[PDB]
Amino acid sequence: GSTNPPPPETSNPNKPKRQTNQLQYLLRVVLKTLWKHQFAWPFQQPVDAVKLNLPDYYKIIKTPMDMGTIKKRLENNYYWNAQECIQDFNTMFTNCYIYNKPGDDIVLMAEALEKLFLQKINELPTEE
Ligand SMILES: Cc1noc2c1-c1sc(C)c(C)c1C(c1ccc(Cl)cc1)=N[C@H]2CC(N)=O
Numbered sequence: 594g595s596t597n598p599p600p601p602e603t604s605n606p607n608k609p610k611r612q613t614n615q616l617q618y619l620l621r622v623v624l625k626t627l628w629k630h631q632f633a634w635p636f637q638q639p640v641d642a643v644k645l646n647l648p649d650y651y652k653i654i655k656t657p658m659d660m661g662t663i664k665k666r667l668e669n670n671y672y673w674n675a676q677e678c679i680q681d682f683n684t685m686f687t688n689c690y691i692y693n694k695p696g697d698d699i700v701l702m703a704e705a706l707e708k709l710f711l712q713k714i715n716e717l718p719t720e721e
Pocket of ligand 1: 634635636640641645647689692693698699
């Protein structure tokens with residue numbers, strides 16, 4: 594039976610990182626807002642292809658991402674800038690759209706969070 598890959602890295606001493614104000618915002622506004630939402634749960638951790646019985650998941654999805662991972666990265670100050678974080682978010686939503694057919698419960702869930710994600714992003718502060 595097929596196994597899961599290791600999750601994405603959340604700490605990496607080689608990688609350059611910063612704490613910006615835009616990045617403070619990405620956890621305090623953007624992630625807080627999504628994490629609490631009723632449709633967040635499928636995205637709070639890596640997709641478990643073994644227990645969900647999705648042996649094709651990690652054949653089709655080559656760059657997995659999830660909010661648990663993004664959360665741990667924000668907390669460990671893993672990022673250099675806001676765009677890196679923002680990119681993880683768009684990878685998460687996109688992976689969901691790529692794997693699942695449109696109109697699926699899980700797509701609707703990704704769509705809702707995404708909206709919230711964009712409403713909180715649009716008022717990203719100026720780099721201070
Ligand atoms: C993220 C993500 N992307 O795809 C999937 C996920 C996850 S994570 C997780 C814990 C579950 C239950 C799923 C669901 C899913 C299916 C229906 C509803 Cl209401 C909510 C999630 N669907 C799988 C795909 C599949 N066909 O099972």
